[PDB]
């Protein structure tokens, strides 16, 4: 479908944009999941909100200054929490001369400047802010309520994992970054850029994710010895030049305001914002995710890490494997090429 495993972009119609899980199944039947990341441009008629001028008083409770130490393309990020502030105050600092986007011509140049100054002048990132900018009237691709099998966690156990089953807002500025990682429980994720400067992504094909983990393990021996899944700490930055040097397949894409970005199970990604902007994100699942969720390597060196019991999914969608699973005898091996079963509708 997509032998190159290259990042794909789709342009659904309003008729296709209405059923979320169905469209995901469609793009997967086109090989979108292979790259581990895909872009989805919503129809021109679609708008999640009428205007984004009524949020200047929105509070960003825990802003973080992103300190970075490293060399030769390998870095570690330490997020320092700063005093709360409103979007208004954040916008002013974001656009200020000291934190504003540098002058440039092409992306390649800005990308070079990012990797060149990422350890200098630590930026502030209004990350992981509970909330949504979606008008409660929109029923298409509403991040606050996608209606995927992931809801079983809340509807069945009455448990709310913020950012995972609830919306998160991200207010970034030039040079703010998100480290290499896969979603918690290796779930899917949806990212919409409400407004502002772009956001660039780097993604590694799921079928090659293990070799990125091994490369990471090598670069950071101590962190690996202390936690098999240390990358879930979201503190590891790795330049594309390093990735290419060690033979790790990958691709890059720049998201623009008004565009959706979808990450798939076990799809490693990382990136940065070109300037002041706002994005909403949350996780979601499909029947294909279940297996990834069952075999997901977790982090236990820390408290409060996202943990989801796979029992309700195995019992419901894999009843004929439940008894063997509970016994810890399930030997299922995942084939990262296969699209989710719901895609069989578009296979004929």
């Amino acid at each position: 479908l997509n032998p190159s495993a290259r990042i794909m972009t789709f342009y659904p119609t309003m008729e296709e944009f209405r059923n979320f899980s169905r469209y995901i199944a469609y793009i997967e039947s086109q090989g979108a999941h292979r790259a581990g990341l895909a872009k989805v441009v919503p129809p021109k008629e679609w708008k999640p909100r009428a205007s984004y001028d009524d949020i200047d008083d929105l509070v960003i409770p825990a802003p973080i200054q992103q300190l970075v130490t490293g060399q030769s393309g390998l870095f570690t990020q330490y997020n320092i929490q700063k005093k709360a502030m409103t979007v208004r105050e954040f916008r002013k600092i974001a656009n200020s001369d000291k934190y504003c986007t540098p002058r440039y011509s092409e992306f390649e140049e800005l990308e070079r400047k990012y990797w060149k100054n990422l350890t200098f002048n630590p930026p502030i990132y209004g990350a992981d802010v509970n909330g949504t900018l979606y008008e409660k009237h929109v029923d298409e691709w509403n991040i606050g309520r996608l209606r995927t099998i992931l809801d079983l966690v809340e509807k069945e156990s009455g448990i709310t994992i913020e950012g995972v089953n609830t919306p998160y807002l991200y207010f970034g500025m030039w040079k703010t970054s998100f480290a290499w990682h896969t979603e918690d429980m290796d779930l899917y994720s949806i990212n919409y850029l409400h407004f502002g400067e772009p956001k660039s992504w780097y993604s590694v094909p799921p079928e090659h994710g293990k070799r990125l983990e091994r490369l990471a393990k090598g670069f950071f021996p101590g962190s690996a010895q202390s936690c098999e899944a240390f990358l879930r700490h979201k503190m590891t930055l790795i330049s594309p030049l390093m990735l290419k040097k060690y033979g790790i397949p990958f691709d890059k894409v720049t998201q623009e305001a008004g565009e959706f970005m979808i990450t798939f199970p076990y799809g490693y990604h990382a990136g940065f914002n070109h300037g002041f902007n706002c994005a909403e994100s949350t996780n979601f699942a499909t029947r294909r995710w279940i297996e990834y969720g069952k075999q997901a390597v977790l982090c236990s060196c820390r408290k409060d890490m996202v943990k989801i019991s796979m029992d309700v999914f195995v019992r419901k969608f894999q009843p004929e494997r439940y008894k063997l699973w509970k016994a810890g005898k399930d030997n299922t091996v995942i084939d990262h090429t296969l699209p989710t079963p719901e895609a069989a509708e578009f296979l004929k």
Binding site: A62, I64, Y78, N79, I80, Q81, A127, D128, V153, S157, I159, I161, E162, G163, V164, Y168, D184, H233, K234, N283, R302, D304, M305, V306, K307, I308, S309, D311
Partner: peptide
Amino acid sequence: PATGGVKKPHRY
């Protein structure tokens, strides 16, 4: 408990 926690990573 078996299920829980939150996406927001630990901050320094």
